[PDB]
Amino acid sequence: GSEKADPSHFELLKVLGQGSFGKVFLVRKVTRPDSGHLYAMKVLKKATLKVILADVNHPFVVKLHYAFQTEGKLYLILDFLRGGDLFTRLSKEVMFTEEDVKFYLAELALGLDHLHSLGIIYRDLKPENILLDEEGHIKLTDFGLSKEGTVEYMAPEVVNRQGHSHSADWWSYGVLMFEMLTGSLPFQGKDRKETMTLILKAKLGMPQFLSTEAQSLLRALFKRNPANRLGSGPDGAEEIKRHVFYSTIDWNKLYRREIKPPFKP
């Protein structure tokens, strides 16, 4: 359905970022029916193709519009998210209010659970990989790998190479929450090794300015044992979505992007 596609059909505007899997540019399609439309083009020097799902249809996951392999490298044409990533915003703001964190985390909860339903494990969860559109809603990017990074976000079972189910994502989700809420990481040492050891002990001091609801959610997510971590069934993501922390969230309208974002790009 997207095969007369060609790299000549897109003019290069600039470079959005340097990925580990490849470079990503801002491009403008030059051919109908979407001439003039802006997209993000990810170039991969490796190769595949197949009809590691990169084509996910969900309001909070970056959409793939085109995919063509021309001259060895593979070109992926994705949504262009105007707002940039959450890491940049966090760096400037130094920390978000619980209101802002609740919104971002609620939308992410849906995005994550969806990927999980497709059997995908979002291994690289962190603010750098969460983009904002022009309205302020979020979109998860740089995902896919099922059969399989930033140490500070690694779950204990991943550090100890004991396993890596979707449960590890919920731990990372907890690290994201803590970092957005405090401006700092829960577990961090002077080097990679010490950080891993700190993660394994999982000893965490709760900053006193966090709401009791925020605190209990974090405690429920930071369970060293994947089996007892929030999100590990039986009701899956629902047990996290039904947590008192998100009591004021209408997941139906959220899915429909009816809830207005706190920050407007």
Domain boundaries, the chain: 1-84, 85-265
- What is the number of other CB atoms lying within 10 angstroms of the CB of residue 8? 9
Q: Taking each helix axis as running N to C, give the angle between helix 98-117 and helix 167-182, from 0 to 180 degrees, rounded to the nearest 10.
A: 160
Distance between CA atoms of 62 and 111, rounded to whole angstroms?
10
* Residue among 176, 177, 224 nearest 201 (CA): 224
Widest CA span in the chain: 58
Distance of CA 245 to the CA centre of its chain: 20
Rg (CA), the chain: 19
C-alpha torsion sign, points 232, 236, 237, 238:
negative
Q: Are 108 and 50 in contact (CB under 8 A)?
A: no
Distance between CA atoms of 106 and 33, rounded to whole angstroms?
35
Distance between CA atoms of 43 and 153, rounded to whole angstroms?
26
Sequence-distant contacts of 122-125: CB under 8 A, at least 24 apart: 122/169, 122/172, 123/148, 123/149, 123/164, 123/168, 123/169, 124/149, 124/150, 125/153, 125/169, 125/172, 125/173, 125/176
Residue 39, both tokens: 């997209």
176-202 core/surface letters (b: 16 or more CB in 10 A; e: else)? bbbbbbbeeebbeeeeeeebbebbeee
Class of domain 85-265 as given by CATH: mainly alpha
In this structure, CATH architecture of domain 1-84? 2-Layer Sandwich (3.30)
Which residues in the chain precede a discontinuity of more than 2.5 Å between C and N?
Answer: 51, 148
* Residue among 245, 190, 191, 199 nearest 222 (CA): 199
Query: Which segments are annotated as binding site?
Result: 16-24, 42
Distance between CA atoms of 215 and 117, rounded to whole angstroms?
28
Q: Are 204 and 222 in contact (CB under 8 A)?
A: yes
Report strand pairing: 23-29 vs 84-85.
Answer: unpaired
* Residue among 24, 251, 253, 240 nearest 129 (CA): 24
Distances from the Cα of 259 to the Cαs of 111, 233, 248, in angstroms? Answer: 15, 27, 11
Q: Are 116 and 108 in contact (CB under 8 A)?
A: no
Residue 144, both tokens: 């896919």
Distance between CA atoms of 115 and 216, rounded to whole angstroms?
25
Header resolution in angstroms: 2.0
Please list the residues that pair with 84 across neighbouring strands. Answer: 132
- What is the number of other CB atoms lying within 10 angstroms of the CB of residue 219? 13
Map tokens 């959005």 to a residue.
16
Distance between CA atoms of 71 and 197, rounded to whole angstroms?
45
Map tokens 């992007």 to a residue.
257
In the 3-class helix/strand/coil scheme, how is the chain assigned residue by residue? CCCCCCHHHEEEEEEEEECCCCEEEEEEECCCCCCCCEEEEEEECCCCCCCCCCCCCCCCECCEEEEEEECCEEEEEECCCCCEEHHHHHHHHCCCCHHHHHHHHHHHHHHHHHHHHCCCCCCCCCHHHEEECCCCCEEECCCCCCCCCCHHHCCHHHHCCCCCCCHHHHHHHHHHHHHHHHCCCCCCCCCHHHHHHHHHHCCCCCCCCCCHHHHHHHHHHCCCCHHHCCCCCCCCCHHHHCCHHHCCCCHHHHHCCCCCCCCCC
Residues tagged active-site: 124
Distance between CA atoms of 156 and 163, rounded to whole angstroms?
9
How were these coordinates obtained? Answer: X-ray
- 186 contact partners, CB below 8 Å, separation of at least 6: 174, 175, 178, 179, 204, 222
Query: Which segments are annotated as binding site for ATP?
Result: 16-24, 42
Distance between CA atoms of 176 and 101, rounded to whole angstroms?
9
